[PDB]
């Protein structure tokens, strides 16, 4: 049903990213078969972006807002909350479900 949050280790229960917030977030991205396509942890570098304003995939906009600082989780994004029917040429096959193991490090 779109984006689903599989909770692994809990956040602080208080600080949740809101629309327009900057988040600092480690992620490991895998395709529906288990193969990694991207990883901020292999670059030793958490990613930073603005949540809820249309700049990341829908699964992150509707999914990262459900986490609190410190939390580990998996966002399971079906293709309509990711790269859709065409996919991402070279990287993401069409209609793919994507699986992001994420850790929310900080909100601003
Ligand atoms: C000049 C632009 C390059 C610029 C690249 C960076 C800043 C480096 C940054 C680590 C991205 C990665 O570079 C290693 C690499 O990350 C992926 O592997 C990936 O894990 C992914 O899915 N992520 C990254 C983590 C957040 C969720 C999602 C994303 O939303 O990413 C965003 C994304 C592509 C959203 C599109 C935007 C267009 C909409 O139409 C579409 O809507 C469906 C969704 C990224 C951050 C963009 O906002 C900014 C950029 O693209 C992509 C598979 C391909 C992407 O490289 C291109």
Numbering used by the authors: 1 to 108
Reported in the publication:
FKBP12 proteins are members of the FKBP PPIase (peptidyl-prolyl isomerase) superfamily and catalyze the cis-trans isomerization of proline imidic peptide bonds. The immunosuppressants first bind to their respective immunophilins, FKBP12 (12-kDa FK506 binding protein) and CypA (cyclophilin A), which subsequently bind to calcineurin in a groove between the CnA and CnB subunits. The immunophilin-immunosuppressant complexes inhibit calcineurin serine-threonine phosphatase activity, blocking the dephosphorylation of downstream targets, such as the human nuclear transcription factor NFAT (nuclear factor of activated T cells), involved in T-cell activation and interleukin-2 transcription, and the fungal transcription factor Crz1 (NFAT homolog), implicated in virulence, stress response, and thermotolerance.
McFKBP12 shares 58% and 65% sequence identity with hFKBP12 and AfFKBP12, respectively. To correlate sequence variations with structure and identify potential differences between McFKBP12 and other FKBP12 proteins, we attempted to crystallize McFKBP12 in its apo form. However, crystals were obtained with the FK506-bound form (2.5 Å, P3221), suggesting rigidification of McFKBP12 by FK506 binding. McFKBP12 shares the same fold as hFKBP12 and AfFKBP12 (Cα-RMSD [root mean square deviation], ∼0.5 Å) with a 5-stranded β-sheet wrapping around an α-helix. The three main loops defining the FK506-binding cavity (40’s, 50’s, and 80’s loops) adopt the same conformation as observed in apo and FK506-bound forms of other FKBP12 proteins. When bound to McFKBP12, FK506 also adopts the same conformation as when bound to other mammalian and fungal FKBP12 proteins (FK506 RMSD, ∼0.3 Å). AfFKBP12 and McFKBP12 also interact tightly with FK506 (KD, 4.7 ± 0.6 and 3.0 ± 0.7 nM, respectively).
